Design a protein around this ligand. Structure first.
Ligand SMILES: O=C(O)c1cc(Cl)nc(Cl)c1
Length: 284
């Protein structure tokens, strides 16, 4: 079926939970043996969210190459994404090593450091220009260059230096700051505006390594971001945009990381975002 009318048909019939459970039943199951080794317990935020072995990002280190991060490679859309958990106190240096080694330009953050009164990720970037951060375990230096605070998101320019080689690179930090503590946003308008700002920066383009996107577990809000992006790109590429099947795209993405899209409300929000976004792209 088309998307917008399949949407109204699920709303009127109140079957979002049944649609979402079908996706969970059909989703791929692949081994995640490296994630579960005992030496990696303090590298995982949640015991039930692990990267598959076949798609995990490897650190370029001979001691321990493990990080809870997955490469989602979308062949028809010609987009790649790295989805990862919010960094932990003992993985902030691994996080920036990955950014460096994979040649990423941008980092997309969809959570606040504290939500619901608890810490959802480490404070992994510097908050003042004159107070840079050094990560001694991976030999990197990170400096805040500039910061632009808007009503729904903040954009930061950062400098990452490889202290071994003295090479430097500019990284863009795109921080969506207004996702609610419970539920999903009422309108997708600010999320789409944010997605378009990431696109306009070049961070999603083939001349750079894959964008790094995270929330707390790296599957829920993060899944919504890449699913909406890929679906809109396919609608631009194809002769028949109504052929884009959001449930099939989600199942394809779940071959590369488990659990993408965590609730039936997130599934409904993804439909809403793609539907509204397809109108703004055009033509009109
Ligand atoms: O390239 C394709 O796979 C494809 C598939 C569908 Cl269903 N529609 C178009 Cl236009 C292209």
């Amino acid at each position: 079926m088309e998307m917008e009318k399949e949407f109204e048909q699920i709303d009127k019939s109140g079957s979002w939970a049944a649609i979402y459970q079908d996706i969970r039943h059909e989703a791929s199951d692949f081994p995640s043996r490296v994630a579960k080794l005992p030496k990696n317990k303090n590298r995982n935020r949640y015991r039930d969210v692990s990267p598959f072995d076949h798609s995990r990002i490897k650190l370029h280190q001979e001691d321990n190459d493990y990080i809870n991060a997955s490469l989602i490679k979308m062949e028809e859309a010609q987009r790649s994404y790295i989805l990862t958990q919010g960094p932990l106190p003992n993985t902030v240096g691994h996080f920036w090593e990955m950014v460096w080694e994979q040649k990423s330009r941008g980092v997309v953050m969809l959570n606040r450091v504290m939500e619901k009164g608890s810490l959802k990720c480490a404070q992994y970037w510097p908050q003042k220009e004159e107070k840079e951060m050094i990560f001694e375990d991976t030999n990197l230096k990170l400096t805040l260059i500039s910061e632009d605070i808007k009503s729904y998101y903040t954009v930061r320019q950062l400098e990452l230096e490889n202290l071994t080689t003295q090479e430097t690179r500019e990284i863009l930090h795109f921080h969506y700051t207004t996702w609610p503590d419970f539920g999903v946003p009422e309108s997708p308008a600010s999320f789409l505006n944010f997605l378009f700002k990431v696109r306009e920066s070049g961070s999603l383009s083939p001349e750079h390594g894959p964008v790094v996107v995270h929330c707390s577990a790296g599957i829920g809000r993060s899944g919504t971001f890449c699913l909406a992006d890929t679906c809109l790109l396919l609608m631009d590429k194809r002769k028949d945009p109504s052929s884009v099947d959001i449930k099939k795209v989600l199942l394809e993405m779940r071959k590369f990381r488990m659990g993408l899209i965590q609730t039936a409300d997130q599934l409904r929000f993804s439909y809403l975002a793609v539907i509204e976004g397809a109108k703004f792209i055009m033509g009109d």
